[PDB]
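Exercise (ungraded).
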Amino acid sequence: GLFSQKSFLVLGFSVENKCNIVDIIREHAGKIVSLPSRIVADYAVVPLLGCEVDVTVGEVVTNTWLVTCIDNQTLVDPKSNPLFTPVSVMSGVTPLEDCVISFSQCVGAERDSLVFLANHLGASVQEFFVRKANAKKGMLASTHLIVKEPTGSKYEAAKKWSLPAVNISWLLETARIGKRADENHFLVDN
Amino acid sequence: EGLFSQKSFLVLGFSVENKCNIVDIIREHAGKIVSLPSRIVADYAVVPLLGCEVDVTVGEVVTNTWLVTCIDNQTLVDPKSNPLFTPVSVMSGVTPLEDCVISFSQCVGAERDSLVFLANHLGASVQEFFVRKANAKKGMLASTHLIVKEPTGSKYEAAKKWSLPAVNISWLLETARIGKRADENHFLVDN
Amino acid sequence: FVPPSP
């Protein structure tokens, strides 16, 4: 099994989400530690923004890391993506309420967590990266493009329309400070 | 810090199993549980959707739907921002929607669970898909009502095409409160 | 307006 010889704790989820996460782990040979225990679990699966963890574990990881491992049939390093460990977000603030964000080169559970962060920070997320606003199509004008690497259809339009194309770390730095981070510090060309 | 950090809770009116699940859920998000008797005015009292008798002074009476919605969205949502977050008044002993087949759209998570609960509590039959004809190959029935929040959407555009009433959530709540099937024209989504 | 990637 994928998670064979691995023990897990599942914390911070509702009753229904916990069962889905529990069954997913067991279907891949994973072991579930029932608290309280003397077993130091290898992993503690927590929500993206984290939760209270009062038991010593090997690594605290998110549901996004878990689902990414299953989609790729590979035990992915939790340290290879900031979304695989709890994301620090300043609560009570919506610093991106003035933004209209479109994503590119983001697929799967990584995209869903990113869309979760953008909406949690007040932003409006659109599948389209448009020039100007078109009310007749339900589309608003775009303000930011979040891409991983240069090149691509949306990226070439961002340089052409003078709209900021930034890394994912701009979204994460915004979430940590509670203020809209400077796009010039997170441009993709640099 | 934690979601329910610096917040105290009371859990009332639930069965043995549901209370244990609610308490652990609260503690996993840095919430505190007040042990009674206490002179502390707890911030919240978590009660069932249809409510129960609450004899201890608290700041706000909230439902399990509000609690799970905060956790599913990882955000402390205002209890006054949705009628399902505080106890919903429902007239008991009546099934005014027993002849109805309700399908939901744009409702997710604990909100949709509560809405399906109310419709079944009023005698209605709830199905996942929005179907025109009663089918034996799948085991479904014909649809009579669609409950949507806003216009647009796959199910909504089909509701106007099939001359089926697309109504608000308030149509379901008003029906449950009065005990009579409410007029759908007063709760259309286009209006 | 750039369409979404397939």
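Further reading is listed at the end of the chapter. For now, observe: The helical segments of chain A are 15-26, 63-72, 109-120, 153-160, 168-177. The beta strands of chain A are 7-10, 31-32, 43-46, 59-62, 100-103, 124-125, 144-146, 165-166.
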